[PDB]
Design a protein around this ligand. Sequence first.
Ligand SMILES: O=C(O)CNC(=O)C(=O)O
Ligand SMILES: [Mg+2]
Ligand code: NI
Ligand SMILES: [Zn+2]
Length: 331
Amino acid sequence: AQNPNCNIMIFHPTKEEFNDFDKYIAYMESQGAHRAGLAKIIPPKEWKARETYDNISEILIATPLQQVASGRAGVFTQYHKKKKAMTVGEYRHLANSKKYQTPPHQNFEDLERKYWKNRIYNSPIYGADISGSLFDENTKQWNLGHLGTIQDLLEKECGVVIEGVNTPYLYFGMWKTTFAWHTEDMDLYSINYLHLGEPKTWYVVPPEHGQRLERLARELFPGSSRGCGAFLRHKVALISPTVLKENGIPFNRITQEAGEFMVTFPYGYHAGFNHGFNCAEAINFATPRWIDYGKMASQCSCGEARVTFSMDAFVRILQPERYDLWKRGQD
Ligand SMILES: O=C(O)CNC(=O)C(=O)O
Ligand SMILES: [Mg+2]
Ligand code: NI
Ligand SMILES: [Zn+2]
């Protein structure tokens, strides 16, 4: 068995290997990359996502989200308070202000220490989940707006034609902006490209151990657990590496820098934080190996998780027994 300790693997494809996206994912999996839940892909030196980032300031963040924490430093939830719209140039200035800027630090490990010590005492503002793309239309390789769609994959594997679309999302971050512990909708893959700016630190639980994280989360968030049998689908809970180590939960960590891709694999729980002003692009995707994960994915039916139009078909076809209850949660 390849990668039996579930380490995060880092890949350096050549320009020739970068042509066929599906083939390269399948290659990475042949080497055991999925066992970690997360892999890093460094593009060939010849590749670029677009020519420059000099003209992005007029992009609108219609609903910036202030991430307010509750709990203790290593075990907290966050809620998202909606703020007034602002442009990317306005948000960059805000991120660089004395109130929000990254503190002085020695290295990524010192910054990580400062994040876990201090996160809860601040409320950073995240421009998340903005439909759109920063890939140039002429970028042919690993262009996250030109991937094969999940609807087409389901149709190729299972023969059923379904409605829905699959488009990318932009994330504009600042110091301390945080992504809570989650798997993707329907336990899909994700791919995330850090277009510019400061790094993003990731934490990940191997898919084979995801239920260990769930059981810890039910213990640490006991009211939330009573409210919903899949409350990590709400995407609000944070657990620090120190707490995970104290409770014996297997995990790994890695820092993504600008110009790098990360791939999350089906049922790989992940969480993380931004180091400073940055912009990432991410999208979900599927492969043949996902289908079994999709059929087994948990679902939130309490009403909190509320998701895209396109998840309807996935539930309806892969999980017909759950469909009625889940759809009630959506309505
Ligand atoms: O970058 C972020 O805030 C969160 N991204 C992801 O969870 C991802 O790409 O799957
Ligand atoms: Mg612009
Ligand atoms: Ni994710
Ligand atoms: Zn729920």
